[PDB]
Amino acid sequence: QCVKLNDGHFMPVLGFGTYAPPEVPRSKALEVTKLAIEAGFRHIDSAHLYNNEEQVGLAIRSKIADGSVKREDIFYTSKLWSTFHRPELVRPALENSLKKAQLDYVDLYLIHSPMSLKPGEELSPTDENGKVIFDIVDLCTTWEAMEKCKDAGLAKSIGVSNFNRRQLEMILNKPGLKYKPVCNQVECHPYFNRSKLLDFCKSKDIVLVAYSALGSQRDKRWVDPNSPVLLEDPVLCALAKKHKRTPALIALRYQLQRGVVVLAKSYNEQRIRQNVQVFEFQLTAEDMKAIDGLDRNLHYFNSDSFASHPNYPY
Amino acid sequence: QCVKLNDGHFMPVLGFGTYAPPEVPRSKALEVTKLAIEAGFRHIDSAHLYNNEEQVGLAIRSKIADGSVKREDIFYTSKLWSTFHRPELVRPALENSLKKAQLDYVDLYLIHSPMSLKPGEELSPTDENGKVIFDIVDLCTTWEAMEKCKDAGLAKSIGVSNFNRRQLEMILNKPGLKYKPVCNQVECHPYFNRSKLLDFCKSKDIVLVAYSALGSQRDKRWVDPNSPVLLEDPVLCALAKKHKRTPALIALRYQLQRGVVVLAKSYNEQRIRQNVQVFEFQLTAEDMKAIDGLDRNLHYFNSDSFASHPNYPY
Ligand SMILES: NC(=O)c1ccc[n+]([C@@H]2O[C@H](COP(=O)([O-])OP(=O)(O)OC[C@H]3O[C@@H](n4cnc5c(N)ncnc54)[C@H](OP(=O)(O)O)[C@@H]3O)[C@@H](O)[C@H]2O)c1
Ligand SMILES: NC(=O)c1ccc[n+]([C@@H]2O[C@H](COP(=O)([O-])OP(=O)(O)OC[C@H]3O[C@@H](n4cnc5c(N)ncnc54)[C@H](OP(=O)(O)O)[C@@H]3O)[C@@H](O)[C@H]2O)c1
Ligand SMILES: COc1ccc(Cn2nnc(O)c2C(=O)Nc2cccc(C(F)(F)F)c2)cc1
Ligand SMILES: COc1ccc(Cn2nnc(O)c2C(=O)Nc2cccc(C(F)(F)F)c2)cc1
């Protein structure tokens, strides 16, 4: 099943998340994306940052070439990284991603983050003390260059990621705006359910796409170990026994019933196949209200290293 | 016990809250304020808004005159209401409060709220449609007039209420500042524990004073009846059984042990006397961590009707 976007295109409502940390050998991205397509995923989320577009692209091409799917069946997303916000760098960045993935177009191209960083060869440019150097860019001129990538046919739709309400309206109030963002991809899960931002996006016809919907990978470089584990929540567990499903399936189904497009990362064959069961069952209105009550405005991303940035989203 | 303010004065760490809704006869404010002092409260929180300074001042005068306390034993607070923010109105507002209470000085005078309103005869001046008429006032000039009240001896200390971090820094960075705010009185409780604002206040030697620390009076005009009842929270009930106290006493001790000065409203003779039991027991470090985990960013006051004010604090 799909949702219609505000530019006419369609986005599958369950997406496969492809990020894995550097400890995971790069060959795994090829194997698991193939397994994701075989299991039923049609929405595939990647990025320049993830250092896996070559392998994710190869998996998509193989499933087209072996005759399982057609290119028009697959919805592939990439993202413009934050050292490429200056508008003359936007289209070269996208053409680079296409060359690495061996695709002619991406279905969706996002501004990865509102926090511009210094242009250069390094992905996370730092000074002598490991402090990350910021760049001052008007994101409305980044958006202009993004719109040109749409008109060029290199991206079917364009959107944003990690933008707050204030940063969204800075784009919606751009003089001469040609294309609204079709979506805003942000952290979203029952401990941080974004109800206020979701209603705002609904009011402007912008899809909210949830990442870390299963509670994140709890990587210690960015996630505090002492934070509570979402998939161990007692309410999620109670509902998992009730419906004879799992806590992950409850968390995924919660998002679908509130109009949120949901991503799910797994590099485990059996869990990949399990996650497509989300279309098989249904939560009652009372179940939904009990999940609603778990909201704590707890975001797992320790972004506090970067609150200095003028465009810090939190 | 008391905490030392950054101006050398001292503030008792447990305060009595005097606000009652209009349906409560004004005579009760006199009666319960005498009961609070008799039970041991020495810090008394009132305001122009509350329409009770006459009865509360009379209660304090009665307990001095009958020999129970001296004036120097009582710490009395009033607040400058939002329609008197213009500097020429500030001292006359304090003089009027002192006349109504028949006191020679207040121990503490606060800017009640950063949201300036149109001067006039109504607490909340409204126009033809029902929208409350705002006012545009440099709050730095309001503070200068507050400083002249301390110089005259009409207020021993001065402070603010319902300020966020940015509004505090605008005062702290003011050129020619003579007196920092001694405190910021804000909504604070286990569902909205203000840890970040607390740390900032500690870093500047400003005391955080907690209101609605028992979960508010759940007035239907301001508080959604669907929000959770703080005093029925299962975690607070369990800690209450361990220490052989009550949920309210757990919530009040929680604040004292993190360096927060805590207010407690009660118009019931037994509950007024119970609340001074906070000095009788302690919470373990593990107890404090379990209360810390309740934080939800839930503020009970439905202030969204005022979200359009330039100085909206949320
Ligand atoms: N725009 C952004 O800034 C941003 C930020 C973060 C993430 N994202 C995107 O969102 C995707 C997913 O978000 P995430 O990476 O935070 O991970 P996630 O989707 O929150 O899921 C995280 C963990 O859940 C486990 N899991 C998956 N299915 C499960 C199941 N059925 N039962 C139990 N455990 C299960 C996985 O471990 P196993 O792999 O061992 O199953 C995975 O490590 C990322 O891959 C990336 O594409 C975007
Ligand atoms: N600066 C501001 O803008 C602002 C805003 C709100 C409040 N305040 C100040 O802070 C004060 C208190 O905050 P609040 O008015 O929100 O009320 P609160 O202190 O959160 O207490 C709320 C309720 O707790 C009940 N209670 C008291 N002791 C109890 C006990 N031991 N066991 C069980 N229930 C108990 C009282 O009901 P009974 O009366 O039936 O005991 C009271 O209605 C106010 O009176 C006012 O002075 C300031
Ligand atoms: C639970 O929160 C998490 C956030 C990130 C990750 C790692 N990660 N995985 N996939 C991705 O796209 C990313 C990633 O770094 N995003 C990002 C990049 C720059 C700035 C920001 C923000 F605006 F949020 F500050 C976010 C894992 C979990
Ligand atoms: C739980 O939250 C509650 C807040 C207020 C009340 C009623 N109340 N009782 N004593 C008081 O001083 C007040 C009061 O209206 N304060 C106030 C006035 C103007 C603006 C603001 C703020 F800046 F917060 F929006 C606060 C009850 C509950």
Coordinates of C-alpha atoms in Angstrom, one line a residue, chain A residues 10-176:
Chain A
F10 CA 3.3 7.6 -4.6
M11 CA 5.4 6.4 -1.6
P12 CA 5.1 2.9 -0.1
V13 CA 4.1 3.2 3.5
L14 CA 6.7 0.7 4.9
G15 CA 10.3 1.4 4.1
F16 CA 13.6 -0.5 4.6
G17 CA 16.3 1.3 6.5
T18 CA 19.8 0.5 5.3
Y19 CA 22.3 2.2 7.7
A20 CA 24.8 -0.2 9.4
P21 CA 27.8 0.9 11.5
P22 CA 31.4 0.6 10.2
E23 CA 31.9 -2.7 12.0
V24 CA 29.4 -4.3 9.6
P25 CA 31.2 -5.4 6.4
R26 CA 29.9 -3.6 3.4
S27 CA 28.9 -6.8 1.6
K28 CA 26.0 -7.2 4.1
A29 CA 24.2 -4.2 2.6
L30 CA 23.9 -6.0 -0.7
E31 CA 22.7 -9.3 0.9
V32 CA 20.1 -7.7 3.2
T33 CA 18.6 -5.3 0.7
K34 CA 18.0 -8.3 -1.7
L35 CA 16.3 -10.1 1.2
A36 CA 14.2 -7.0 2.0
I37 CA 12.9 -6.9 -1.6
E38 CA 12.3 -10.7 -1.7
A39 CA 10.3 -10.3 1.6
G40 CA 8.1 -7.5 0.2
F41 CA 9.7 -4.1 0.9
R42 CA 9.4 -1.7 -2.0
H43 CA 10.6 1.6 -0.3
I44 CA 14.4 1.6 0.2
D45 CA 16.1 4.4 2.4
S46 CA 19.8 5.2 1.9
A47 CA 22.1 8.3 1.8
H48 CA 25.5 9.6 0.9
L49 CA 26.5 9.5 4.6
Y50 CA 25.8 5.7 4.9
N51 CA 28.7 4.6 2.6
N52 CA 26.5 1.9 1.1
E53 CA 24.9 3.3 -2.1
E54 CA 27.1 1.1 -4.3
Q55 CA 25.8 -2.1 -2.6
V56 CA 22.2 -0.9 -2.2
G57 CA 22.1 0.1 -5.8
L58 CA 23.5 -3.3 -6.8
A59 CA 20.8 -5.1 -4.9
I60 CA 18.0 -3.1 -6.6
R61 CA 19.6 -3.7 -10.1
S62 CA 19.9 -7.5 -9.4
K63 CA 16.3 -7.9 -8.4
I64 CA 15.2 -6.0 -11.5
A65 CA 17.6 -8.1 -13.7
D66 CA 16.5 -11.4 -12.2
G67 CA 13.0 -10.4 -13.0
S68 CA 11.5 -10.1 -9.5
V69 CA 10.6 -6.4 -9.8
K70 CA 10.6 -3.5 -12.3
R71 CA 12.4 -0.2 -11.6
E72 CA 8.9 1.5 -11.4
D73 CA 8.0 -0.8 -8.5
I74 CA 11.0 0.3 -6.3
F75 CA 10.9 3.7 -4.4
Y76 CA 14.6 4.5 -3.7
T77 CA 15.6 7.5 -1.4
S78 CA 19.0 9.2 -1.1
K79 CA 20.0 12.3 0.8
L80 CA 22.2 15.4 0.2
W81 CA 24.8 15.6 2.9
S82 CA 25.4 18.8 4.9
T83 CA 28.8 19.7 3.3
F84 CA 27.0 20.1 0.0
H85 CA 24.3 22.7 0.9
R86 CA 25.9 25.5 -1.2
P87 CA 23.7 25.5 -4.3
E88 CA 26.4 24.9 -6.9
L89 CA 27.2 21.6 -5.1
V90 CA 23.7 20.2 -4.9
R91 CA 23.3 18.7 -8.4
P92 CA 26.9 17.3 -8.6
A93 CA 26.2 15.6 -5.2
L94 CA 23.1 13.9 -6.6
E95 CA 24.8 12.9 -9.9
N96 CA 27.6 11.3 -7.8
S97 CA 25.0 9.3 -5.8
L98 CA 23.4 8.1 -9.0
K99 CA 26.7 7.0 -10.5
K100 CA 27.6 5.1 -7.3
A101 CA 24.1 3.4 -7.2
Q102 CA 24.1 2.8 -10.9
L103 CA 20.6 4.3 -11.2
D104 CA 19.3 6.9 -13.7
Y105 CA 17.1 8.7 -11.1
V106 CA 16.2 8.6 -7.4
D107 CA 12.5 8.5 -6.4
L108 CA 13.2 10.8 -3.4
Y109 CA 16.1 13.3 -2.6
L110 CA 16.2 14.9 0.8
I111 CA 18.1 17.6 2.5
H112 CA 19.6 15.3 5.1
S113 CA 19.8 17.9 8.0
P114 CA 19.2 21.6 8.4
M115 CA 22.8 22.1 9.8
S116 CA 25.1 23.3 7.1
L117 CA 28.8 22.3 7.4
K118 CA 32.0 23.6 5.8
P119 CA 32.5 22.4 2.1
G120 CA 35.4 20.2 1.5
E121 CA 36.5 16.6 1.1
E122 CA 36.0 15.5 4.7
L123 CA 32.5 14.3 5.7
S124 CA 32.7 15.8 9.2
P125 CA 35.2 18.6 8.9
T126 CA 36.9 19.4 12.3
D127 CA 39.4 21.8 13.7
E128 CA 42.4 21.2 15.9
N129 CA 40.2 20.2 18.9
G130 CA 37.7 17.9 17.0
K131 CA 35.1 20.6 16.9
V132 CA 32.9 20.4 13.8
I133 CA 33.1 23.5 11.6
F134 CA 29.7 25.0 10.6
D135 CA 28.9 26.8 7.3
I136 CA 26.4 29.7 7.0
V137 CA 23.9 28.9 4.2
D138 CA 20.4 30.1 3.3
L139 CA 18.5 26.8 3.1
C140 CA 16.0 28.5 0.7
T141 CA 18.9 28.7 -1.9
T142 CA 19.6 25.0 -1.2
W143 CA 16.0 24.3 -1.8
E144 CA 16.1 26.2 -5.1
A145 CA 18.9 24.0 -6.3
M146 CA 16.9 20.9 -5.1
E147 CA 13.9 22.1 -7.2
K148 CA 16.2 22.2 -10.3
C149 CA 17.1 18.6 -9.7
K150 CA 13.4 17.7 -9.9
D151 CA 12.9 19.6 -13.1
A152 CA 16.0 17.9 -14.5
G153 CA 14.4 14.5 -13.9
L154 CA 17.2 13.2 -11.6
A155 CA 14.8 13.2 -8.6
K156 CA 11.1 12.3 -8.9
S157 CA 10.2 14.0 -5.6
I158 CA 12.2 16.2 -3.2
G159 CA 11.8 16.6 0.6
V160 CA 13.7 17.4 3.9
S161 CA 14.9 15.6 7.0
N162 CA 15.4 16.6 10.6
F163 CA 13.6 20.0 10.1
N164 CA 11.5 21.5 12.9
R165 CA 8.2 23.5 12.4
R166 CA 10.2 26.8 12.1
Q167 CA 12.6 25.4 9.5
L168 CA 9.7 23.8 7.5
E169 CA 7.9 27.2 7.2
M170 CA 11.1 28.9 6.2
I171 CA 10.8 26.7 3.0
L172 CA 7.0 27.1 2.8
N173 CA 7.3 30.9 2.9
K174 CA 10.2 31.0 0.3
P175 CA 9.4 33.7 -2.3
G176 CA 8.9 32.1 -5.7

